[PDB]
Symmetry: C3
Subunit: 346 residues, 3 copies
């Protein structure tokens, strides 16, 4: 650990500063809690209401937000870039990451003869690499994880401990899979028999995880019966998420924790799926669609914008619906007020 002054911090960040440049800083903290020795940031408007009174010895602020608060006696770090990224730079100054302590390929790691392991890879204890698997260069295979038969882990990916990647899975470049996640599990499909009974079907389709994808903890992705399941590049998936068989997740999308997409559904590019939300099967989510948390998308969405509720309706339309449902006592009163002036006899 070390200390940086406000002027000394500015040059390292390549950021213009305003205020008392001798302010000494020894850590990092959020805007609502930071002490004089702490550094902070502001990127949003529904956050700026806490800036007026903040002890922080350094505040990272954009050129836009700086305009509304520049006169205030606070110490500033004014940047034309995202205040959040500039803030991470400051975070990575103070805390250092730590690995397991088992570098390279651990003697325990069982690797199948026919598997191809590239140069500069780390395989932690008790990991199992199956037949004809291809672990790329500069990859990390976490402790106890499983790389399935004929599966490919593209270069620079990071598999965390105890992860099951099943047979025939394409993992892209620099993909990060959190611990406990399962890729290429069987899709929930059965033969609906005549006595009402359910007969298993071996799903054999590929699961393709493209470059720059992130998969959260214990998230499960199902493979199709014989066609592909795809999570297109730059998409970020959170914890405990369900991706059904033959789902296509479009590029640079986000699926928040505990959300679920049902079988054979196309999610478009730059789509946000809120937490605990549920999108049903055989439907299409248009590009740039934002779901609220706990949304039931039952029909296909065919235009961008903010959606929410069960079923899915535009934000404007549910925000009005909720505030009109809340209005039902008052509306009934107006009926009682009207059923009072029906004492009309003559």
């Amino acid at each position: 650990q070390s200390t940086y002054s406000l002027e000394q911090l500015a040059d390292f960040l390549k950021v213009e500063f305003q205020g008392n440049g001798a302010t000494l800083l020894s850590g990092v903290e959020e805007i609502e809690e930071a002490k004089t020795a702490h550094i902070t940031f502001l990127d949003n408007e529904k956050y700026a209401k806490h800036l007026k009174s903040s002890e922080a010895g350094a505040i990272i602020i954009s050129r836009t937000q700086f305009q509304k608060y520049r006169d205030l006696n606070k110490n500033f770090l004014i940047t034309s870039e995202s205040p959040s990224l500039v803030f991470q730079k400051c975070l990575e100054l103070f805390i250092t990451p730590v690995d397991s302590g088992f570098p390279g390929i651990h003697p325990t790691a069982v690797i199948h003869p026919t598997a191809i392991i590239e140069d500069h890879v780390c395989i932690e204890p008790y990991a199992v690499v199956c037949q004809h698997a291809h672990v790329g260069s500069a990859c990390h295979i976490g402790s106890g994880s499983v790389i399935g038969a004929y599966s490919t882990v593209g270069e620079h990916s990071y598999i965390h401990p105890r992860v099951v990647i099943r047979e025939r899975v394409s993992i892209g470049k620099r993909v990060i899979i959190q611990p406990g996640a399962v890729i290429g599990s069987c899709g929930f499909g059965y033969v609906t028999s005549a006595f009402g009974q359910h007969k298993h079907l071996k799903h054999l389709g590929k699961v393709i995880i493209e470059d720059d994808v992130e998969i959260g903890a214990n998230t499960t992705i199902d493979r199709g019966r014989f066609k592909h399941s795809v999570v297109r590049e730059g998409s970020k998936i959170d914890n405990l998420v369900q991706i059904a068989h033959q789902v296509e997740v479009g590029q640079h999308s986000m699926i928040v924790a505990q959300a679920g997409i049902a079988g054979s559904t196309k999610i478009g590019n730059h789509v946000i799926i809120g937490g605990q939300a549920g999108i049903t099967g055989h439907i299409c989510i248009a590009d740039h669609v934002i779901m609220m948390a706990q949304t039931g998308v039952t029909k296909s969405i065919t235009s961008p914008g903010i959606y929410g509720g069960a079923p899915a309706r535009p934000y404007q339309e549910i925000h009005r619906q909720v505030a009109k449902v809340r209005n039902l006592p008052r509306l009934e009163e107006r009926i009682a007020a009207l059923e009072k002036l029906v004492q009309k006899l003559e």
Copy 2:
């Protein structure tokens, strides 16, 4: 380019299935009925496709006898089966993508098996799996890499346990059972003794989890053991991924619980029940035979009669359809009062 090429007749004889049309027709893959080309094999599956069979350019269509008789006059290559068209199709599919194992045959040396545990003939135990005291693994079983077969736990013949499954102590697994990676079977139930004003004290659960024949359990699904009673999944039932089965829950025969749904404690589910994805079911209630819950259903009382159910709380489909409608048509109902209120005379 595909794996293999068959004639219509050659393939028909391989399947032990009658054919109609050009027996010489070359067939080199499979496809969905509405996409299949000449080289492709497909199946008509009783549901739709009346007009979509007529205009199908497939080189082979797997059809039931009852349905071939109806489409007898059509100019198509038919593979007529007495079994399920889809089930036959599976065999066909498996000729073009042959299913693959991890490439570790037999019982791997790195498998820890308790001296007391009994392992039957022709079983396969993959690397790093653990078989605890007095466990009983039936013949033709598969224990996936680094899975745990708990103390006094039994696994019926021909059952397939995938990698990193935990089967706790005192859990009974039927024959032909398939468990996807990372399921937890026999975890403690969420029940406690309250004491010292709201403080919760651990209760040891000593009930069993009884999984019956031909049952499937999805990936990272968790099934809790009872306090003293048992948690039972009856014959042929299919539980998807990320499902939660609480302590002392009973699921009847040939029932389906889709991904991310949860049943609370001491609740009985009937036979031929479909529990929609993400749906929730309260504890100490009953779900009758042949009940179907839509996704995200919140069941708060018992359901005694069959049919389709939706909403939170759950009500018979038609009712919640009628509700969403009326709720949506609230502004129209308000203008119906507002303009009616405008009539204010004498």
Copy 3:
């Protein structure tokens, strides 16, 4: 093994408890109060179950002194206790069904322990568990098979970790803590900066996860680490299966989170709070001490006073209960508007 039968009297002595009914009454197991036959011991702890008491053919009923006084006139075999009837029932439960361990005592040959890690006394580490650099295993801990104790992470005394648990790096586990199988403690939190292109950049999370004393965590539950600050779960709190705890979430003392519930980033849950199954609580909000949230609740804003809440969005029990009732009433309501328009002549 245990076709074990005890007399009502024998049991009463072991229980150190007052009784009513024939001493010789032979009891050979436990059963729930609705179903209990003459062979069986059962308990009445919950007042919703006082119904099944009147017609009970049970061989023995564990009961509080107050409930006995109330149902005194009944001719049933009573075991009368001043403690929790459920706890006393637990003592019987264990007499018939003895618990069991894996059968691999102490530190198993096949465990991997990084030389720099510290292992205390009377600790059990099961087959193929991995303990990473500079970890600390408290005295009399249980590490389940194939469990990972990540770097610089510490596990307190008498803590019980079940098989295939991932404790990621820099995670503090308190004393007595029990973690069910498949749990992930200390995964990276969900945080990205979206570029003026639509592309999402990975923000590295360096914060800890602090699990306090007597905390329990359910199967396949995931608790994320903060970006800089910590995610804390305080004393006594019990978390169920399949639960999401986002980065920088603080959970209070003696709080309960039922299965499949979720808490978004940087939210503080107070003490003695119940979060119903599958409930969802947004980020950057606070939940007051002594708050119950019904299952499937969608909490979109801070709850600042104690009570029972429900629905999506969340409103206090009273109001939501009315709201649902009035939505139920809609068809009847507009029929009154129809008869209103009927008279216009």
